[PDB]
Symmetry: C4
Subunit: 450 residues, 4 copies
């Protein structure tokens, strides 16, 4: 065997089947409308159509060999897959899109390729590929815009073909509106035919309407309907363009809107230009160093038993340098990684101060912190990455003259990325295995006596 | 009896009255402006107008026979309904729209059907039908787009009629702007008249303006006003189109935006392509198997005493296979169905692990789980649908060497849809009837000894 | 005083000063550009300009006599108000807009009314009136759309005047782009002048561009700049139109989106058409009876000491029929009115059932409820409006064989609007005055014995 | 060293390098396409190009001398900065944009300035400056709109240059579509050349299309592609304009939407016009006095150890007049400034009333309050700014006949801005230093006895 739709093989086949479906959606109508296209390159159209039909057949086979999830397990029983396929509307659409209507080439002649129009009924495969690509691609907005542009181009191409067909029905050159006479040297070339039809279609669907006005009632009606199709469908698509660009700007726009609200508040309250500059510097840091997004709000949509792995694969850089995690229990790190709230501190920010509520443990992910003196400048100890502080005031200790108080003040030399671990959480998670707690308050007593 | 507006009969009548109202809103102005329309098909217009008026009268009768809610009860007293009708502005509008202005046909002649313009004053019924359909239809966006297209078409039709009337007032063919001379063979046909007027209206309201420019001051003024009506009203309607398409994409766009934020985080943090593939697979599963929507956020707008029924009608498939619910008390299932949080687990995800906080009971809705050994591969027990686990570590038990600990580790073979029932909730809800609890810890002791 | 800007007198004056400001913003540029406008109606323009200037002077006086809030109190000291006025930029703008530039009529002649262009510098007053109207009017969206249309019209009018002025500078009729020769009988009329200039402006600002193309470099540059002004500013304004219509649809669109999510869930889960019809009926009820909006989310932006008054003025209809409120303490009703959560129940919905957690007291605002038998049909007692139930299981009672249990089952005959009062809240709020509690458990014992 | 990108020097250099990048992005294509531009002002183009290249070199030097943050510290080691520069793609782009392609002037002649097209590869610097300006400027929306207008102008300019180049390739005047013959006196001027090309570009990119239609297939194709570029890219940019105006209106629109929901509720519930006027007055006050924004929601994105400084720099005006803060401990004010919830009370609003739950302490930021008698009018004490009340009922006091009760009723004479400090918070924060608490209940006893 089976293909496992989640796999890469299924996605690759989705591409390989979208190619014929897109080809069919673009060219069947073109060949049906522009007769010279069908006739001049008939030897190539036959090859391409037969290849497309072969790929359609192989796609039907793949649909027979693609497993589905019952009880969460991939069904691998062949006949069960055949039944699941045939019971779905997709099998009906596939049989309809693979009906050998090409036999009508013997009745209607080689000049009627619209018999292959049923081949469009595999559009679903194409759309599936798109909805898969949009999910799996690393450039979701680039692909989304390319998809919208493809839709625009297909719509304009189809409307060009429709215009040319209507000109044919009315008669080429019978009036100033229809496509001019084919017998003209310049206006008889297939290139000119298609490109002028596309020009007309673009002027109509984009509602520019710089083309010769209608003469007959059918022409007036078609032009009204087509200008309305233009207005509505092009507003739809080119406003989807707008929404895609909006969601492209979503993060940056939200960040900038927050900054603007802050600046409005500061200018209204006449906040000192010192503090205004400090705030602007904080936000410039958040942007430049790519910290505007908070991983919590993003990863909250992941499963906890997958977001856990995510956090591990991101923070194993530092949670191996820490003494508590991955050293004593070697598994405890998972119990708290999904609750280590990542904080960022500016240079000179006092994370801790003597005589404060010690309700948070900190793990230094990045940055240089200092166990300073209360004078403000004298740096007693420099804590680099992997260090952990703020854990002594969490625990119950014998001989602690300072209970629930910070034993020292910790300031940040530079921008520090820390993991604030709350006291309640450390309490709750160390209950399972105190084999790490013993050396934890080993460190605790050792630092509390000195 | 009375009609009970909530019923299907009332909605069917809403359709049957919207038909004449829509007919009146489309055709009265057309016949008033295009005199040949009124004259040539007068025998049909008379029949249709009289049928419309009869339906208007029957709609007034229905309004007299439609109950309203006082004290939440449907008023069935006839005279009370007559008073409620006559006291409402709707009765005034109905009498105004049913005034026999057709008598003016004897004074103004058969060429003045705008006397029936008062018939437009039942627009409310039409709109009511729409606002009912949008609520009750299964295709809300299809109907909404059809409604907007109907508004566009009606506006363009009315503007076409207005253009033709203005041409008539100025005189057909008196200058290049107005509709050409009626005496022309081609430009005198009612078909050509209406269709060219519609063409002009479309070019003007869609602000394409490819029509002959104004010559007189009245023409310049009307064209300015009409181009502005075009800009404003068509932006309104065709931006409502945009918002409707947006809300069509709302679920998919939110899902894809979450996936994009996740992928941005993973690529920025250089998350391993293993875990990136796992996350993409999780999201592909959520989409393909239609799990992107969380029933909680959707059904939270339902009444609890209706959302309860909803959850029952959805989850009675599994809550009959469970041993606790619908078996001992047979009513307890409602006390917890509105708090069974549905979770989804990937293949191989450890739902439970030995030596963890047993604070959640799980009911396997769909999927195969395994009571494995801690080695990781040896599957002791396979739990299929209807099974419940994680309930032993909830309860107070005699002789439990493992208190508040998982007696075994449960992993998911495939994608498991479970119902996580919190410990606090099971505690709170079993307090009412311990007739099920006794066999609950029957199972508990039986599994805790073996 | 003083005038007290919050008062109605200040708003009326805002209108009376917006009239000259709007007049000045519309007509000064018109008279400056269309010389015939200035000249032909000079006797009227002089009167209107002098009246506008008098009103400007009276507006300056009002600004001297309008109090401001210092320490939250309206300043009534005259000289303090004069200082507050003169210290503001508004005084500078007012003196600039009232500078007697009309004296230049003696130097530049009566054909130069753009000397009155400084009169536009009172635009602020106009805008203030708008921002006041939008706040105080009952039709905020009608006024907002009218304001946007006024901006569109003013912009188009100004661009028409600019086009005519540029034609004058280049010379009327010197090329096909500029306004045609004034000496023409038809193209020399002030009506034709202004209306064709407005036509050109509309075709340009709405980016239709169906006007004679530029001939000179200045004309090309102006047309480029004006088409870009068109694109940008008209997108701005006519997209503000879109956002205004969106916020017009905001409530209805949110309601309908909730209904659509519900219907999607129900159709996906194959919810029985019984329950689907019940849900659709619930939502039809919510809409038809105007219950889609929840007063909590709306009134949460009001002050509690004003939202309290709001809730009182709305619910004194029923909280006078209740026995506890406004009867014993006569002031207790305010302590709980801001926490009476309004619920709606469908016909047949069991609000209470025997043997359930009695943690909510209910006050029947509207609707008929029944104290039924557990059989389901036998109605023991019918509770109409003003009745209160679910209070016995809240209180501590002697001789209650049923503790924390519902003494009877309450069902809703029809759609009941109730006030669910939580047990914790009744406990917390009755602590202040048990003078009502005594008769409360009077009723309690009386019903618990029978 | 180093430059410290957060500093003002780096931003100034960002401007000084954006000037050549913008110059290059505007003029290289212009000179490449309009040959007369390159030739006539070659002496000036050479100077400007060499100055631009010198500034590019100095920008490369700056990039070598700009520190980056490792461990949150600004790297000042020269060679480390050289490595960080050369290891980034920016160094590749800078070397590519500074390659001396001007040497090709000796081969291709002075008429080929597109060899300087590589100079566009420093676009990043320009964009960086923009993203810095948008952050640091006080007019974010003005700058954003200016940036979008710059993008529009650059796109139109580039498309004008492209049109002129295509006309050159096809041949000037070979058909009606291309730019006319250069040999024409009027259509040969560089001014006319560029300005008509810009006119064509504007008519095409804004999809007005009032220019001579295509004649050749290449012209038709280019016009189709360019009209589509117009539609898509101009919708993008001029809808970004819409979103920028939306976020300009965001605060005012949210405020007005809240007011509209309130007014809809009041008119639907038939709220008395007294209370409707009171609510409208409250909202008029909120707007006029600039209180629609709540500093909590804005400043919650700031760091707590920066939002603290913000609140201090804003509220030190009053927290120096208070007796508790900045007087006894002199540091306690920071422990509670981030939890002082700012409330606003209308004139006559009873903040406190005798016999109520004293769970909030109030600090009068602005406004006159009264310790009144319960009669309602007799004002015992007038509390101005700096005063604090509601603190007696917080504390545990000996001899308090009124426990957890308000000792008096406090009403607001005028609009009072207060700081509501919750009881729990005062309890929690005074635990650290009771040196202020002693005089706190000094005041407490002193007022409780009298
Ligand atoms: N007092 C003290 N604290 C230190 C030293 N080195 C690291 N620390 C950390 O500084 C922290 C300050 O807050 P805590 O008292 O909670 O915990 C303290 C220790 O974790 C040291 O040498 N002396
Ligand atoms: N230990 C054990 N647990 C089982 C077995 N079969 C099912 N389970 C479930 O596995 C669950 C693991 O978590 P709990 O200990 O809370 O509850 C356990 C039982 O509900 C079994 O055979 N042995
Ligand atoms: N048992 C009983 N309850 C009644 C009667 N009339 C009204 N009620 C209300 O029905 C309510 C059901 O819930 P509670 O027991 O909390 O409170 C009960 C009473 O408030 C009655 O006649 N008998
Ligand atoms: N009773 C009384 N209260 C006063 C007086 N002056 C100020 N107050 C304040 O009024 C407040 C009312 O609420 P509290 O009793 O909590 O605290 C009271 C005091 O803080 C006074 O003279 N008498
Ligand atoms: Ca257009």
């Amino acid at each position: 065997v089976v293909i496992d739709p989640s796999g890469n093989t299924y996605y690759n086949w989705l591409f390989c089947i979208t190619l014929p479906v897109m080809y069919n959606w673009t060219m069947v109508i073109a060949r049906a409308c522009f007769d010279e296209l069908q006739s001049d390159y008939l030897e190539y159209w036959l090859i391409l159509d037969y290849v497309s039909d072969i790929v359609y057949l192989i796609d039907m086979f793949v649909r027979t060999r693609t497993g589905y999830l019952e009880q969460g397990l991939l069904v691998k029983e062949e006949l069960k897959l055949i039944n699941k396929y045939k019971s779905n509307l997709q099998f009906k659409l596939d049989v309809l899109s693979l009906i050998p209507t090409d036999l009508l080439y013997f009745k209607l002649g080689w000049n009627y390729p619209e018999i292959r129009l049923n081949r469009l009924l595999r559009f679903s495969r194409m759309f599936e590929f798109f909805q898969r690509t949009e999910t799996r691609t690393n450039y979701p907005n680039i692909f989304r815009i390319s998809n919208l542009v493809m839709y625009i181009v297909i719509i304009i191409h189809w409307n060009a073909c429709v215009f040319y067909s209507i000109s044919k029905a009315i008669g080429f050159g019978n009036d100033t509106w229809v496509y001019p006479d084919i017998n003209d040297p310049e206006f008889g070339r297939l290139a000119r035919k298609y490109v002028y039809s596309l020009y007309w279609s673009t002027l109509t669907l984009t509602t520019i309407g710089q083309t010769p006005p209608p003469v007959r009632d059918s022409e007036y009606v078609f032009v009204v309907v087509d200008f309305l199709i233009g207005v509505l469908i092009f507003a739809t698509i080119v406003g989807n363009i707008g929404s895609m660009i909006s969601n492209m700007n979503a993060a940056r726009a939200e960040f900038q809107a927050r900054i603007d609200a802050i600046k409005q508040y500061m200018h209204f309250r006449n906040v000192s230009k010192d503090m205004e500059k400090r705030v602007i510097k904080w936000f410039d840091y958040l942007w430049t160093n790519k910290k505007t997004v908070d991983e919590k709000e993003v990863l909250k949509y992941l499963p906890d038993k997958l977001r856990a792995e995510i956090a591990i694969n991101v923070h194993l850089d530092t949670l191996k340098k820490v003494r508590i995690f991955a050293d004593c229990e070697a598994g405890l790190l998972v119990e708290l990684v999904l609750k280590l709230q990542p904080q960022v501190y500016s240079p000179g920010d006092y994370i801790c101060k003597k005589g404060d509520i010690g309700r948070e443990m900190y793990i230094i992910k990045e940055g240089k912190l200092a166990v300073v003196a209360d004078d403000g400048v004298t740096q007693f100890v420099v804590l680099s990455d992997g260090s952990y502080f703020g854990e002594i005031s969490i625990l119950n200790i014998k001989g602690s003259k300072a209970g629930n108080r910070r034993t020292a003040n910790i300031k940040s030399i530079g921008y520090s990325d820390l993991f604030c671990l709350s006291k309640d959480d450390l309490m709750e998670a160390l209950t399972e295995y105190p084999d790490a707690k013993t050396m934890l308050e080993e460190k605790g007593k050792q630092i509390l006596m000195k």
